[PDB]
Short mmCIF file of C-alpha atoms in Angstrom, two decimals:
data_model
loop_
_atom_site.label_atom_id
_atom_site.label_comp_id
_atom_site.label_asym_id
_atom_site.label_seq_id
_atom_site.Cartn_x
_atom_site.Cartn_y
_atom_site.Cartn_z
CA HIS A 1 -4.76 121.05 11.69
CA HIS A 2 -7.13 119.01 13.85
CA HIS A 3 -6.48 115.84 15.82
CA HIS A 4 -8.70 113.62 13.68
CA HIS A 5 -7.70 113.16 10.04
CA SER A 6 -9.87 112.22 7.07
CA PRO A 7 14.53 110.74 14.60
CA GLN A 8 16.94 108.23 16.18
CA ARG A 9 17.95 109.64 19.58
CA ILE A 10 15.05 111.07 21.57
CA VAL A 11 14.97 113.00 24.82
CA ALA A 12 11.58 112.60 26.45
CA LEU A 13 10.47 115.46 28.65
CA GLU A 14 7.16 115.33 30.51
CA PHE A 15 4.48 113.18 28.81
CA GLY A 16 7.14 112.08 26.32
CA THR A 17 7.79 108.92 28.31
CA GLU A 18 4.48 107.20 27.61
CA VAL A 19 4.89 108.07 23.93
CA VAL A 20 8.32 106.46 23.48
CA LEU A 21 7.46 103.46 25.67
CA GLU A 22 4.44 102.67 23.50
CA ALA A 23 6.57 103.12 20.37
CA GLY A 24 9.17 100.69 21.71
CA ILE A 25 11.79 103.42 21.44
CA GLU A 26 14.64 103.84 23.92
CA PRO A 27 15.29 107.45 24.98
CA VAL A 28 18.74 108.97 25.47
CA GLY A 29 17.29 111.16 28.21
CA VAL A 30 14.07 111.14 30.22
CA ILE A 31 12.17 113.07 32.88
CA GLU A 32 12.65 111.62 36.36
CA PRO A 33 10.52 108.42 36.51
CA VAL A 34 7.65 108.43 39.01
CA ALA A 35 6.92 104.81 39.94
CA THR A 36 3.16 105.20 40.23
CA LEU A 37 2.86 105.98 36.50
CA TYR A 38 4.46 102.78 35.28
CA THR A 39 4.49 99.01 35.66
CA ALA A 40 7.32 97.38 37.62
CA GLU A 41 9.00 96.30 34.38
CA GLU A 42 8.63 99.79 32.87
CA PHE A 43 9.99 101.60 35.93
CA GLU A 44 13.08 99.41 36.30
CA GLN A 45 13.58 99.82 32.57
CA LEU A 46 13.10 103.61 32.72
CA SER A 47 15.71 103.85 35.50
CA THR A 48 18.38 102.74 33.02
CA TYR A 49 17.95 106.12 31.31
CA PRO A 50 19.76 109.42 32.03
CA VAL A 51 17.58 111.90 33.92
CA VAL A 52 17.35 115.26 32.14
CA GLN A 53 14.33 116.73 33.94
CA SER A 54 13.29 116.75 37.59
CA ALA A 55 9.82 115.69 38.69
CA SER A 56 9.39 119.37 39.53
CA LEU A 57 9.63 119.96 35.77
CA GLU A 58 12.95 121.81 36.17
CA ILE A 59 15.01 121.10 33.06
CA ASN A 60 18.73 120.32 32.92
CA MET A 61 19.90 121.88 29.65
CA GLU A 62 23.43 120.61 30.26
CA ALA A 63 22.44 116.96 30.80
CA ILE A 64 20.34 117.11 27.63
CA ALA A 65 23.32 118.52 25.75
CA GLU A 66 25.39 115.53 26.86
CA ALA A 67 22.64 113.14 25.74
CA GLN A 68 23.03 114.47 22.19
CA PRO A 69 19.42 114.23 20.98
CA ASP A 70 18.25 114.78 17.41
CA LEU A 71 14.72 115.32 18.69
CA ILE A 72 13.28 116.52 22.00
CA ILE A 73 9.60 115.89 22.72
CA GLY A 74 7.06 116.62 25.43
CA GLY A 75 3.64 118.00 26.28
CA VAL A 76 2.88 121.33 27.90
CA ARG A 77 -0.09 122.47 29.96
CA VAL A 78 -1.58 125.24 27.82
CA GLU A 79 -1.41 127.70 30.71
CA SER A 80 2.40 127.55 30.70
CA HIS A 81 2.58 128.19 26.96
CA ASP A 82 4.40 131.53 26.76
CA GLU A 83 6.79 130.22 29.41
CA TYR A 84 7.68 127.25 27.19
CA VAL A 85 8.19 129.44 24.13
CA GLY A 86 11.48 130.51 25.68
CA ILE A 87 12.20 126.94 26.78
CA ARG A 88 11.77 125.70 23.20
CA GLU A 89 14.13 128.41 21.92
CA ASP A 90 16.72 127.41 24.51
CA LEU A 91 16.21 123.71 23.78
CA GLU A 92 16.37 124.12 20.01
CA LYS A 93 20.04 125.11 20.33
CA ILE A 94 20.58 121.41 21.10
CA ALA A 95 18.09 119.73 18.78
CA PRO A 96 14.71 120.20 17.07
CA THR A 97 12.17 120.54 19.87
CA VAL A 98 8.52 119.53 19.54
CA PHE A 99 6.05 120.56 22.24
CA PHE A 100 2.27 120.25 22.14
CA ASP A 101 -0.19 122.09 24.35
CA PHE A 102 -3.13 120.41 26.03
CA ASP A 103 -6.06 121.76 28.02
CA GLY A 104 -8.17 120.41 30.87
CA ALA A 105 -7.96 116.95 32.40
CA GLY A 106 -9.95 114.96 29.83
CA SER A 107 -9.58 114.15 26.14
CA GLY A 108 -6.98 116.89 25.71
CA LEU A 109 -4.21 114.72 27.13
CA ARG A 110 -4.71 111.55 25.07
CA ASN A 111 -5.02 113.71 21.97
CA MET A 112 -1.80 115.53 22.86
CA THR A 113 0.17 112.28 23.15
CA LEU A 114 -1.44 111.07 19.91
CA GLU A 115 0.29 114.00 18.22
CA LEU A 116 3.62 113.20 19.89
CA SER A 117 3.33 109.58 18.76
CA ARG A 118 2.92 110.74 15.14
CA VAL A 119 5.96 113.02 15.40
CA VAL A 120 8.22 110.24 16.71
CA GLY A 121 6.94 108.11 13.83
CA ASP A 122 4.43 105.87 15.62
CA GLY A 123 1.22 107.41 14.27
CA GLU A 124 -0.17 104.11 12.98
CA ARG A 125 -0.63 102.27 16.28
CA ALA A 126 -1.60 105.58 17.90
CA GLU A 127 -4.33 106.43 15.39
CA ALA A 128 -5.51 102.84 15.58
CA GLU A 129 -5.86 103.12 19.34
CA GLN A 130 -7.92 106.32 18.99
CA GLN A 131 -10.35 104.65 16.57
CA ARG A 132 -10.51 101.56 18.78
CA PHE A 133 -11.42 103.75 21.75
CA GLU A 134 -14.22 105.41 19.78
CA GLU A 135 -15.52 102.04 18.58
CA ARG A 136 -15.41 100.42 22.02
CA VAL A 137 -17.34 103.34 23.53
CA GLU A 138 -20.05 102.89 20.91
CA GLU A 139 -20.11 99.11 21.36
CA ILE A 140 -20.07 99.20 25.18
CA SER A 141 -22.75 101.89 25.51
CA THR A 142 -25.32 99.86 23.56
CA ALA A 143 -24.30 96.38 24.76
CA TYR A 144 -24.88 97.42 28.39
CA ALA A 145 -27.36 100.23 27.73
CA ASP A 146 -29.51 98.96 30.60
CA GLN A 147 -26.82 98.88 33.28
CA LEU A 148 -25.52 102.29 32.21
CA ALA A 149 -29.05 103.66 32.50
CA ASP A 150 -29.80 102.58 36.07
CA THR A 151 -26.40 102.55 37.78
CA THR A 152 -24.76 105.50 39.50
CA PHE A 153 -20.96 105.45 39.48
CA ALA A 154 -18.42 107.38 41.52
CA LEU A 155 -14.66 107.79 41.25
CA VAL A 156 -12.66 108.61 44.37
CA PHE A 157 -9.10 109.08 45.44
CA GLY A 158 -7.89 110.01 48.90
CA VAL A 159 -5.72 112.84 50.16
CA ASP A 160 -4.40 113.84 53.61
CA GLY A 161 -7.33 114.17 56.01
CA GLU A 162 -9.75 114.40 53.11
CA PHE A 163 -10.82 112.52 50.02
CA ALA A 164 -11.93 113.51 46.51
CA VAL A 165 -14.76 112.70 44.12
CA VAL A 166 -13.68 113.01 40.48
CA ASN A 167 -15.76 115.28 38.25
CA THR A 168 -17.26 114.61 34.82
CA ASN A 169 -14.55 116.68 33.12
CA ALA A 170 -11.45 114.90 34.42
CA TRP A 171 -9.56 111.58 34.22
CA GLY A 172 -11.65 108.45 34.86
CA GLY A 173 -14.65 110.67 35.49
CA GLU A 174 -14.29 112.13 32.01
CA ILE A 175 -14.08 108.68 30.48
CA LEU A 176 -17.04 107.46 32.55
CA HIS A 177 -19.01 110.47 31.35
CA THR A 178 -18.04 110.01 27.71
CA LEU A 179 -19.35 106.46 28.01
CA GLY A 180 -22.70 107.87 29.11
CA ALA A 181 -22.59 106.49 32.66
CA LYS A 182 -24.47 108.20 35.48
CA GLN A 183 -22.28 109.61 38.23
CA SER A 184 -22.87 110.55 41.88
CA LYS A 185 -24.14 113.92 43.12
CA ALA A 186 -20.94 114.26 45.14
CA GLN A 187 -19.64 115.65 41.85
CA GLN A 188 -21.88 118.73 41.94
CA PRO A 189 -19.75 121.01 44.16
CA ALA A 190 -16.79 120.52 41.79
CA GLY A 191 -18.30 122.81 39.15
CA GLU A 192 -15.56 123.34 36.58
CA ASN A 193 -12.95 121.91 38.95
CA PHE A 194 -11.55 118.43 38.40
CA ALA A 195 -12.69 116.99 41.72
CA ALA A 196 -14.88 117.80 44.70
CA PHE A 197 -13.22 117.45 48.12
CA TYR A 198 -14.81 116.15 51.32
CA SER A 199 -13.96 115.44 54.94
CA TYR A 200 -14.33 111.90 56.29
CA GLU A 201 -17.60 112.97 57.91
CA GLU A 202 -19.04 113.75 54.49
CA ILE A 203 -18.58 110.18 53.23
CA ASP A 204 -22.38 109.89 53.25
CA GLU A 205 -22.41 112.06 50.11
CA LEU A 206 -21.63 108.86 48.19
CA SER A 207 -24.77 107.05 49.34
CA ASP A 208 -26.35 107.36 45.89
CA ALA A 209 -23.40 105.40 44.49
CA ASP A 210 -24.20 101.85 43.41
CA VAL A 211 -20.63 101.29 42.23
CA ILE A 212 -17.46 102.97 43.47
CA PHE A 213 -14.07 103.14 41.76
CA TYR A 214 -10.90 104.12 43.61
CA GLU A 215 -7.71 105.21 41.84
CA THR A 216 -4.67 102.98 42.05
CA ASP A 217 -1.18 103.11 40.57
CA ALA A 218 -0.11 101.25 37.44
CA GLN A 219 0.09 98.07 39.52
CA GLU A 220 -3.43 98.27 41.01
CA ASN A 221 -2.05 99.53 44.33
CA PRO A 222 -3.92 102.29 46.18
CA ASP A 223 -1.76 104.97 47.81
CA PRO A 224 -1.84 105.20 51.64
CA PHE A 225 -4.34 108.09 51.51
CA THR A 226 -6.73 106.11 49.34
CA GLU A 227 -6.23 103.11 51.62
CA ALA A 228 -6.92 105.41 54.59
CA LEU A 229 -10.23 106.36 52.96
CA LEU A 230 -11.15 102.70 52.59
CA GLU A 231 -10.37 102.08 56.28
CA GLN A 232 -12.74 104.70 57.75
CA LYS A 233 -15.57 102.92 59.59
CA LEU A 234 -17.98 105.43 58.10
CA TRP A 235 -16.89 104.13 54.69
CA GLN A 236 -18.02 100.59 55.53
CA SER A 237 -21.62 101.88 55.74
CA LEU A 238 -22.16 103.05 52.10
CA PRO A 239 -24.64 101.06 49.89
CA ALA A 240 -22.02 100.21 47.25
CA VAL A 241 -19.49 98.93 49.77
CA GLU A 242 -21.79 96.48 51.53
CA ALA A 243 -22.89 95.43 48.05
CA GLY A 244 -19.31 94.40 47.25
CA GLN A 245 -19.15 96.84 44.35
CA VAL A 246 -16.00 98.81 45.15
CA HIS A 247 -13.29 98.29 42.56
CA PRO A 248 -9.73 99.46 41.82
CA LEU A 249 -9.06 101.60 38.75
CA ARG A 250 -5.71 101.80 36.97
CA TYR A 251 -4.72 104.59 34.58
CA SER A 252 -7.49 106.98 35.63
CA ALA A 253 -5.21 109.74 34.29
CA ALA A 254 -5.23 108.07 30.85
CA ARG A 255 -2.29 109.82 29.21
CA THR A 256 -2.80 107.95 25.93
CA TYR A 257 -5.62 106.19 24.06
CA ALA A 258 -3.91 102.88 24.91
CA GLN A 259 -4.25 103.79 28.59
CA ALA A 260 -7.74 105.19 28.11
CA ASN A 261 -8.90 101.85 26.66
CA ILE A 262 -7.52 99.97 29.68
CA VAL A 263 -9.94 102.18 31.63
CA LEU A 264 -12.75 101.14 29.25
CA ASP A 265 -11.81 97.50 29.88
CA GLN A 266 -12.08 97.95 33.64
CA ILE A 267 -15.39 99.78 33.32
CA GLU A 268 -16.67 96.96 31.13
CA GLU A 269 -15.74 94.10 33.48
CA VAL A 270 -17.73 95.65 36.31
CA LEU A 271 -20.70 96.09 33.97
CA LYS A 272 -20.64 92.32 33.39
CA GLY A 273 -21.49 91.54 37.02
CA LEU A 274 -24.11 94.27 37.04
CA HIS B 1 -12.56 122.49 52.67
CA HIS B 2 -8.78 122.54 53.10
CA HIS B 3 -7.88 121.04 49.71
CA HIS B 4 -8.86 123.17 46.70
CA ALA B 5 -7.66 142.28 54.78
CA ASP B 6 -4.01 142.28 53.67
CA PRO B 7 -1.60 142.56 56.62
CA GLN B 8 1.86 143.93 57.50
CA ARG B 9 1.48 144.17 61.27
CA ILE B 10 0.47 140.81 62.71
CA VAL B 11 -0.05 139.53 66.26
CA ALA B 12 0.51 135.78 66.48
CA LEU B 13 -1.38 134.01 69.27
CA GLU B 14 -1.08 130.28 69.86
CA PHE B 15 -0.18 128.24 66.74
CA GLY B 16 0.27 131.54 64.88
CA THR B 17 3.99 131.51 65.58
CA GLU B 18 4.93 128.66 63.26
CA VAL B 19 2.91 130.43 60.59
CA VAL B 20 4.59 133.85 60.72
CA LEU B 21 8.03 132.22 61.00
CA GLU B 22 7.55 130.03 57.92
CA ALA B 23 6.30 133.09 55.99
CA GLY B 24 9.28 135.25 56.94
CA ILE B 25 6.99 137.68 58.75
CA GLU B 26 8.10 139.61 61.83
CA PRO B 27 5.16 139.70 64.27
CA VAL B 28 4.49 142.77 66.40
CA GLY B 29 3.00 140.63 69.17
CA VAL B 30 3.58 136.98 69.97
CA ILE B 31 2.53 134.33 72.50
CA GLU B 32 5.21 133.52 75.08
CA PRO B 33 7.97 131.48 73.34
CA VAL B 34 8.52 127.96 74.68
CA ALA B 35 12.04 126.91 73.73
CA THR B 36 11.36 123.22 73.10
CA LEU B 37 9.23 124.11 70.05
CA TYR B 38 11.87 126.08 68.17
CA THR B 39 15.47 126.03 67.02
CA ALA B 40 18.09 128.04 68.90
CA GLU B 41 18.00 130.77 66.25
CA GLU B 42 14.19 130.82 66.07
CA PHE B 43 13.94 131.14 69.84
CA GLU B 44 16.62 133.82 70.12
CA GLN B 45 14.79 135.89 67.52
CA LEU B 46 11.29 135.25 68.91
CA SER B 47 12.38 136.62 72.32
CA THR B 48 12.77 140.08 70.78
CA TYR B 49 9.05 140.32 70.06
CA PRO B 50 6.53 141.65 72.63
CA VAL B 51 4.69 138.97 74.63
CA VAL B 52 0.91 139.34 74.36
CA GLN B 53 -0.19 135.86 75.46
CA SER B 54 0.92 133.67 78.35
CA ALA B 55 2.18 130.12 77.84
CA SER B 56 -0.92 129.23 79.86
CA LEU B 57 -3.01 130.73 77.04
CA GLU B 58 -3.94 133.90 78.94
CA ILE B 59 -4.43 136.87 76.61
CA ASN B 60 -3.12 140.30 77.63
CA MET B 61 -5.72 142.38 75.77
CA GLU B 62 -3.89 145.67 76.31
CA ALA B 63 -0.46 144.43 75.24
CA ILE B 64 -2.13 143.46 71.97
CA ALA B 65 -3.70 146.92 71.86
CA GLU B 66 -0.35 148.67 72.11
CA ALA B 67 1.13 146.39 69.46
CA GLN B 68 -1.39 147.98 67.09
CA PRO B 69 -2.17 144.95 64.92
CA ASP B 70 -4.04 145.05 61.62
CA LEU B 71 -4.45 141.28 61.78
CA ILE B 72 -4.58 138.84 64.68
CA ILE B 73 -4.20 135.12 64.01
CA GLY B 74 -4.24 131.93 66.05
CA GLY B 75 -5.52 128.38 66.29
CA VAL B 76 -8.08 127.13 68.78
CA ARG B 77 -8.65 123.60 70.07
CA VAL B 78 -12.15 122.57 69.02
CA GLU B 79 -13.25 121.90 72.61
CA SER B 80 -12.71 125.55 73.56
CA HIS B 81 -14.89 126.97 70.75
CA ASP B 82 -17.51 129.26 72.32
CA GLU B 83 -15.04 130.55 74.93
CA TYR B 84 -13.04 131.91 71.98
CA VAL B 85 -15.96 133.35 70.00
CA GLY B 86 -16.18 135.60 73.02
CA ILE B 87 -12.45 136.37 72.95
CA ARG B 88 -12.50 137.22 69.23
CA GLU B 89 -15.10 139.90 69.93
CA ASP B 90 -12.90 141.81 72.38
CA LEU B 91 -10.08 141.14 69.92
CA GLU B 92 -12.00 142.28 66.85
CA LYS B 93 -12.27 145.66 68.58
CA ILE B 94 -8.48 145.92 68.18
CA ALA B 95 -8.06 144.51 64.67
CA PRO B 96 -9.46 141.86 62.31
CA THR B 97 -9.16 138.52 64.12
CA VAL B 98 -8.78 135.08 62.56
CA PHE B 99 -9.23 131.99 64.73
CA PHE B 100 -9.45 128.49 63.28
CA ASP B 101 -10.58 125.36 65.09
CA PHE B 102 -8.81 122.02 64.86
CA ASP B 103 -9.69 118.59 66.20
CA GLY B 104 -7.58 115.74 67.50
CA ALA B 105 -3.82 115.25 67.48
CA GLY B 106 -3.41 114.26 63.83
CA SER B 107 -3.89 115.86 60.41
CA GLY B 108 -6.18 118.49 61.94
CA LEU B 109 -3.30 120.65 63.14
CA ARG B 110 -1.16 120.95 60.01
CA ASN B 111 -4.34 121.73 58.06
CA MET B 112 -5.40 124.43 60.51
CA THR B 113 -2.04 126.19 60.10
CA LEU B 114 -2.27 125.71 56.33
CA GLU B 115 -5.34 127.93 56.63
CA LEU B 116 -3.53 130.50 58.77
CA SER B 117 -0.66 130.60 56.29
CA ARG B 118 -3.20 131.41 53.58
CA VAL B 119 -4.71 134.23 55.64
CA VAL B 120 -1.32 135.91 56.20
CA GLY B 121 -0.59 135.75 52.47
CA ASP B 122 1.62 132.66 52.35
CA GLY B 123 -0.78 130.15 50.84
CA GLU B 124 1.54 129.31 47.94
CA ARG B 125 4.41 127.80 49.93
CA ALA B 126 1.94 126.29 52.40
CA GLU B 127 0.01 124.44 49.70
CA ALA B 128 3.32 123.37 48.18
CA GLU B 129 4.29 121.75 51.50
CA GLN B 130 0.94 119.97 51.73
CA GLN B 131 1.29 118.60 48.19
CA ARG B 132 4.89 117.59 48.89
CA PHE B 133 3.88 115.75 52.05
CA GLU B 134 1.23 113.81 50.14
CA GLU B 135 3.61 112.96 47.29
CA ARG B 136 6.38 111.81 49.63
CA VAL B 137 4.05 109.54 51.59
CA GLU B 138 3.06 107.87 48.31
CA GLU B 139 6.73 107.81 47.30
CA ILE B 140 8.23 106.49 50.57
CA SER B 141 5.44 103.92 50.96
CA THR B 142 6.22 102.25 47.62
CA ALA B 143 10.01 102.69 47.65
CA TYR B 144 10.34 100.96 51.04
CA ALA B 145 7.25 98.76 50.76
CA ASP B 146 9.28 95.78 51.99
CA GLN B 147 10.75 97.45 55.08
CA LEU B 148 7.34 98.90 55.96
CA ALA B 149 5.82 95.42 55.77
CA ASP B 150 8.31 93.54 57.92
CA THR B 151 9.14 96.22 60.50
CA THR B 152 7.20 97.12 63.64
CA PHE B 153 7.73 100.64 64.99
CA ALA B 154 7.10 102.39 68.29
CA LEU B 155 7.12 106.02 69.41
CA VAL B 156 7.70 106.79 73.08
CA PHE B 157 8.02 109.77 75.36
CA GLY B 158 8.73 109.89 79.08
CA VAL B 159 6.77 111.37 81.93
CA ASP B 160 7.34 111.46 85.69
CA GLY B 161 7.70 107.90 86.98
CA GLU B 162 5.98 106.56 83.86
CA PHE B 163 6.37 106.60 80.09
CA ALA B 164 3.99 106.67 77.14
CA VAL B 165 3.60 104.86 73.85
CA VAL B 166 2.06 107.08 71.16
CA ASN B 167 -1.09 105.91 69.35
CA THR B 168 -2.03 105.82 65.63
CA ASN B 169 -4.26 108.89 65.90
CA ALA B 170 -1.69 111.27 67.35
CA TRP B 171 1.49 113.18 66.48
CA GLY B 172 4.44 111.07 65.29
CA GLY B 173 2.26 107.99 65.62
CA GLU B 174 -0.37 109.40 63.27
CA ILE B 175 2.21 110.20 60.61
CA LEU B 176 3.79 106.76 61.02
CA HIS B 177 0.31 105.30 60.57
CA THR B 178 -0.51 107.47 57.56
CA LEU B 179 2.70 106.22 55.96
CA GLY B 180 1.46 102.64 56.39
CA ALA B 181 3.99 101.46 58.97
CA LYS B 182 3.36 98.70 61.49
CA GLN B 183 3.40 99.82 65.11
CA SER B 184 3.82 98.06 68.45
CA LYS B 185 1.00 96.35 70.36
CA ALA B 186 1.77 98.63 73.31
CA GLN B 187 -0.64 101.01 71.57
CA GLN B 188 -3.63 98.79 72.39
CA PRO B 189 -4.80 100.11 75.80
CA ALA B 190 -4.91 103.65 74.36
CA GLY B 191 -8.16 103.05 72.49
CA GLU B 192 -9.24 106.51 71.33
CA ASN B 193 -6.64 108.19 73.54
CA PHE B 194 -3.47 109.74 72.10
CA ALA B 195 -1.12 107.62 74.19
CA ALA B 196 -0.97 104.55 76.40
CA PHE B 197 0.89 105.00 79.70
CA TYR B 198 3.08 102.46 81.48
CA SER B 199 5.31 102.08 84.53
CA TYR B 200 9.02 101.32 84.14
CA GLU B 201 8.10 97.74 85.08
CA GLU B 202 6.16 97.19 81.87
CA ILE B 203 9.02 98.13 79.53
CA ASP B 204 8.77 94.54 78.26
CA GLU B 205 5.55 95.58 76.48
CA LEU B 206 7.86 96.87 73.73
CA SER B 207 9.49 93.55 72.86
CA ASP B 208 7.78 93.28 69.46
CA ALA B 209 9.24 96.65 68.44
CA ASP B 210 12.03 96.35 65.88
CA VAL B 211 12.62 100.11 65.83
CA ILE B 212 11.96 102.73 68.51
CA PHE B 213 11.56 106.50 68.13
CA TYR B 214 11.82 108.82 71.13
CA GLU B 215 10.44 112.35 70.96
CA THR B 216 12.94 115.18 71.30
CA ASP B 217 12.75 118.96 71.13
CA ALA B 218 13.40 121.03 68.00
CA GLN B 219 17.13 120.69 68.71
CA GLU B 220 17.23 116.88 68.94
CA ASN B 221 17.38 116.92 72.75
CA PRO B 222 15.19 114.53 74.76
CA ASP B 223 13.52 115.91 77.90
CA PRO B 224 14.84 114.59 81.26
CA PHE B 225 11.90 112.18 81.68
CA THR B 226 12.42 110.68 78.24
CA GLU B 227 16.09 110.60 79.14
CA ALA B 228 15.19 108.66 82.29
CA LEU B 229 13.26 106.06 80.29
CA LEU B 230 16.32 105.34 78.13
CA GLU B 231 18.34 104.92 81.34
CA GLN B 232 16.09 102.27 82.95
CA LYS B 233 17.86 98.91 83.30
CA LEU B 234 14.97 97.05 81.70
CA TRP B 235 15.28 99.29 78.62
CA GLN B 236 18.64 97.93 77.34
CA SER B 237 16.86 94.55 77.49
CA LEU B 238 14.54 95.38 74.58
CA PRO B 239 15.33 93.84 71.17
CA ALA B 240 15.24 97.21 69.39
CA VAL B 241 17.65 98.64 71.96
CA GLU B 242 20.19 95.84 71.56
CA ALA B 243 19.76 95.96 67.78
CA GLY B 244 21.00 99.56 67.73
CA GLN B 245 17.67 100.80 66.39
CA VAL B 246 16.66 103.56 68.79
CA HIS B 247 16.41 106.98 67.17
CA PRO B 248 15.36 110.52 68.17
CA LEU B 249 12.27 112.09 66.54
CA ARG B 250 11.91 115.86 66.21
CA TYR B 251 8.59 117.58 65.48
CA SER B 252 6.47 114.58 66.51
CA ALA B 253 3.78 117.13 67.35
CA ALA B 254 3.88 118.30 63.72
CA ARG B 255 2.25 121.72 63.70
CA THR B 256 2.63 122.42 59.98
CA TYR B 257 3.24 120.42 56.79
CA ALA B 258 6.84 121.64 56.65
CA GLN B 259 7.31 120.07 60.08
CA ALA B 260 5.41 116.94 59.09
CA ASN B 261 7.88 116.59 56.18
CA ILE B 262 10.85 116.78 58.57
CA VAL B 263 9.26 113.85 60.42
CA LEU B 264 8.98 111.98 57.09
CA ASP B 265 12.68 112.71 56.46
CA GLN B 266 13.66 111.14 59.78
CA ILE B 267 11.52 108.06 59.11
CA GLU B 268 12.98 107.76 55.58
CA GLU B 269 16.52 107.89 56.95
CA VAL B 270 15.88 105.07 59.41
CA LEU B 271 14.08 103.13 56.67
CA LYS B 272 17.26 103.50 54.59
CA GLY B 273 18.71 101.25 57.26
CA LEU B 274 17.05 97.96 58.23
#
């Protein structure tokens, strides 16, 4: 009952989308597609599917009932567990309903979708990806052991009037940490929180950064807020920026091991010019 | 940072009005209601409440006293800091007093009131609005990425004998800028100022504008001066005016995130044209 080991018509609730897409399955119902999570091809594909959940996570039991699923899948944030006990009961009147809980913003997610991939019958590729991730981390950490030892990384995204520096326990900061990379001291105020927030005046916190990553969507596009952060004249004064070492980062969220490796690939490419 | 007693008898000074309204709180004391800032129903209601501050920002310390507050809230322009540290003292003798500073004419205001909404016990809805604003910018920017690339916007308001073109660091112009929109070159002489002023002779400075927004009050009514600008004979000469693309903009001076979303709605609607 651990993550590591030694159906025909699927409704995909939240986090179920990435699982069925990777398995080449077509869902009979899907949570409302958010464009930033998917490639252009994927999004225009996903839009051909009936919406059975809002992006606010509000579920449409009736629309699901019309979809006639034989299996309903999705992940749940562990904090909302008891809440989803009732939801599963309600949903199981339509079809067998498999939920999995996940915790934090790091490995918990890509493990959770590994379990969903097994359930929908795609455990082979999914377990392969997990092993590949673990191998690549080993291989990368020793192949560039020098660069990882003397370079300080930072991951940022922007919000409204402020920006964030991603912590060692979350998204691309988790993956960077798992690799063994050093990360900026802008992280320190985050504590157990996923990011540390700063005003545009506090951009100078990232002066110990030799390399900076900034989150983008699935098509390498920064959101306006992240672009706004890159525009600030105070930003154009950081060591890493006038070194030409500021790079885009796709799939920082890393909802699967397949996605998490794409992060490893981006981290690796930068290490080649380092 | 903005991103992450208990009251029942609140006096709302300047900028505290939008906060108590949005929270469904009836204030015991309120700054003199200016009708252009509120709906007909909001204004009608707000006139019931005792006036404890003048529209010229003069505080009636004894009217506040009789109101018997247990909490006094309001926002302060950053320039007038020390002058208000003083005021809080005399105020703190009446009840706990919360003043927040804000800077500029952009994101600083809706964040300041986000903080006041937290203080009065309404931080949930307030943070929801902030998150929703940030999501919808991201959303609108990508969904209309074409329109936003090919279109040049302008925001104008009228004054006596002159008119103004709003800059990228202020009000409706800031939000338009945050979205990623292109805006007219009439903004240039503003520099760091919130607006660039012109005579009715220089209306031709808006020839590159494909779309034009004109500030109105909370009830979609332009002020007489703005109304005069739209009457000028050189105005119906502009491309955007003879293309049918001149629209009213409410809540340009977006005081809260709820208001800043209503601005985004209006921009989205126009963008659903073009």
